[PDB]
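Quick question: what would this complex look like in 3D?
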Amino acid sequence: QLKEADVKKMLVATTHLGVRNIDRRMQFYIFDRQKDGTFVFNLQKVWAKIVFAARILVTIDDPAEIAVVANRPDAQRAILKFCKYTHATAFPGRFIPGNFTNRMNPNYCEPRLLLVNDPVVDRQAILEASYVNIPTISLCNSDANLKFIDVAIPCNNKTPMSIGLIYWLLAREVLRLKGSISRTEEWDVKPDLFVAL
Amino acid sequence: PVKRRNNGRSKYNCGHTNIVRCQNCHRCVPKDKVIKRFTIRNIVDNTIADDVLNACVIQGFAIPKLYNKVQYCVSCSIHNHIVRVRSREDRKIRTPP
Amino acid sequence: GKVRTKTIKRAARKIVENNYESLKPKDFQNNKAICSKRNVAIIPSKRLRNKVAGYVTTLMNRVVKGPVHGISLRLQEEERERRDNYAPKKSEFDVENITVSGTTQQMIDSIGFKCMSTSLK
Amino acid sequence: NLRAKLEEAMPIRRAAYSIIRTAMRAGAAGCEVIVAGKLRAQRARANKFKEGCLISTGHPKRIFLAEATRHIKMRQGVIGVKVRIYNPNIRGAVMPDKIEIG
Amino acid sequence: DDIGMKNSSGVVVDAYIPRKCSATNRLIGPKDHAAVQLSVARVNDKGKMIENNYVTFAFCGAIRSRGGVDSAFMLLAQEHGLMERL
Amino acid sequence: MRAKWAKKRMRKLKRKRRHMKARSK
Amino acid sequence: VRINVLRDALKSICNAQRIGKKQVIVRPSSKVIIEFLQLMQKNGYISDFAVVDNHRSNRIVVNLIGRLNKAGVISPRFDIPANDIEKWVVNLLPSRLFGHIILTTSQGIMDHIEAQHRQIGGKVIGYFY
Amino acid sequence: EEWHPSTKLGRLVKAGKIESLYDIFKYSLPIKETEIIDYFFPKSELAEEVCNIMSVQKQTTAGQRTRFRAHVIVGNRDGFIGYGAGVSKEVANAIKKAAKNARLNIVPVRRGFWGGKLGDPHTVSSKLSGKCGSVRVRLIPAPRGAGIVASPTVAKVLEFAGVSDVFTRQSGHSRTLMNSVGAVYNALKSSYSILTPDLWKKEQLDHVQDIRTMSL
RNA sequence: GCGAAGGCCGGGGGCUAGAAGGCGAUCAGACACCACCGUAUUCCCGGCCGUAAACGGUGCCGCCCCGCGGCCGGCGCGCGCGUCCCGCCGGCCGCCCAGGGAAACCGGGAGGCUCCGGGCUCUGGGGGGAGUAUGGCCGCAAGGCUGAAACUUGAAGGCAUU
């Protein structure tokens, strides 16, 4: 059930774009290659992944158990807004190893789900997930390593416009399943809040 | 213990390579194993270059550059610090330092 | 030739992140007076107290003269919050700015919706 | 108490471990017991059993420690026991470096 | 029926019956710490809202180290109707 | 090279035995 | 070149199960492979096997149900006394109750259990559990 | 003093939300509290023996420091075994570290019938094998008439598993004890991860029976 | 059958280096390292010889096996259109998830192996004695190839840690 408004926003957002390097796991999602070399994503496949992630994200009884981790400076605002507009527990910047496994660690969350901006950048959390049975969802690019990631969303994840709009789009669907949004009317929260200047 | 995958040499799909001579030690080294640095340094020093350019009575003169490929043996090169012993992990690392 | 120890640095940084308003930027003595209050902090000795005060007057100059890392000040925290919360008044972001990749038009065609009847180029 | 407990021939580790407990319970943050001599052997050795953090140097050490030296006598020879107990809460003042900052 | 070891009587004597994951089908170990169970909700009819009828897909740590879960999740989603085959 | 020099020294002993046998013959 | 074809294919089936791939393509096809696959399908360790017939040796595409631990060939195809087939099972197969040693008999290719049922000895094609 | 849970699993265990130890093993959950093992095993804990302490030394400028590593096997007599090792300068503290670690790594053991099934699993369910360092031990299902046939260290952990009869065969540096017991530990953790035909029924999808789902 | 170098038998050659040798120095002594000189040799032809850390220290013929790139030799798929892209590749390679190992490390295998069996040929069985003794064969020689025993003895060895 793709919506025209978000797709036109994605066209400005460049979510339809990916790095020239490409991976076989994400080959299904990608549509083609620009003659410049840049890889162009299938927007509807991204939206189907975004809606799928929402269904998974809501199941957890406390939306405080999903953990949003970003070390990318650009994504920090996105995952903090998402944690504020929704109810996720933010673990931004350096993840601090043993956060998910060390009980005597200053923060020792036991999350039921994980959220990652970049598979390579936020690698510490995805390894930590393995030690304590935590599934993970990530914002993957065209070349990414899907190791230890249960579901991945095809997106730039290096574009501030793309990172912010994706988190906004994800937020809209997660609370839509809880009835706190509109469905067929625009969310009052705007995508420019998720994006840093 | 095999210290290096290369085995110290870049001979691949080969059995024998040209012998070369350490420029200081005058020793015979396999061409692949030799240091093989290259210098394009000019003939006269940078300071002398201004004095010589003012002295030259021909217009458009530029200092001639001198080109040589310095090949040194492992013992010769490490001693004069052309290359350096590296840490086990830093030995794997390549690239000009 | 005077490098402060961790204890001096740690105590001074709590003093600044809490009583920033009491401290003054260039004068050690006003900062030393704040250290002398005792209700704010317990400082054993005169030299120990002077060192915490001296670092705290440098910290006070530094926090007014640009942000200092690791300094938890509530008033500065509000200042970023209004800046972060404010988004463009007309919310001008995508603004229906269109612009596609040549390959993207074919991908949009692949879905079959064909946004804007292929006038996206 | 240790020197006389050691005489009944109790385990030397157990002796120190029991004494270590009664000092920490009485409040000492730092407890140190070192028994040195020809223990269960014909050769010298020193056996430090310690529970907690003890200051070992400076002016605080003079007023904040309780070093007591006794010389046990044994058929093998003298196996002197040394016990040092450190109390930060000495009520005479505060540790020179202890910044309360509350 | 009654997965486990049925005795000569037919009583199950296999204590806890391990979980064969939804893709690879290898039994989840007693100490298989990377086993992950992720649940996707069903939108209830018209409304874009939950029904508390979420279906749960288990994923063993062997196919997760491979990274095979994202593809396996997608295929299995259409098998349980959480997506269209496209 | 002790092993290379040790092989050389066995060779010499082998020649001495081989030649001594001829004188004995 | 390929002297044993069953072994090369069975190794591929086990290798695909390791990387969790349902469908495998076996490049060499044979009647012994055909029968070995049929017996595994009956015991449900493998699912339907479809042979793409070619004008040459033939290839088989086998759908796997993810339920085979290991398969194997015995080279050479030894002679087993019917009485000592139990010894072959005790060592090669884990547990007398579970696992199948696949034999060849003048009556036909048969299961170790069926071989015991009529007490006929034979040659071991291989083994699957 | 008493136990105060620092782990979410511990809080559920303290409440009594988790009925059996096996429930956490269905979800293959880590046990980070030895106190949780006591909750399911409160009378005399589990049978634990300290099987040989080997002195270990690090050369230093002054001399060789000495630290002790102890290997402890915690187990009951039925489908529950744990092996851990602990390093401490004081032998006693190291024995405690091993026993606590062994409690943190309790693992279920399958158990089964060699050829004849009566009322009790009397032997290992399969030819379970494991390898720690050079050593490799294979535990072969044995008839109920046969006893557990293994060397004294491996027999000890096979008694704690409660495998009444086994035909173990060990190859490698079995003389190295730590490595030998570790192989007999990894063989028993393999038992509950070996797919067998009886386990081919298809299901799961518990959802509310999930241990993460439970809440204080 | 072929086989680096050194050597050898006999010619051709003979610049350069340079096993021998001689001489300076250097040292307590160097007759060694460093100068300097220089015979055999180094080069060519006709034979020998049959060895090298002749090493990827990893036989050969297969079968499957995951990513990430590079290079070289063909061949296609297209595309404005370029020694571009994308495959198929035949090899040469780097890195590596599983997997393997005592580990170093391999992962184009050293994987698919105690859950041990595709086929073939070779080799090893604690260390010395000993690659010696003796017999054979081959060589002009130097030697090479085959190859013990008496006796002696608790380690030798691998890879890693401090």
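Answer marked as accepted. Chain D touches chain H through two residues (CB under 8 Å).
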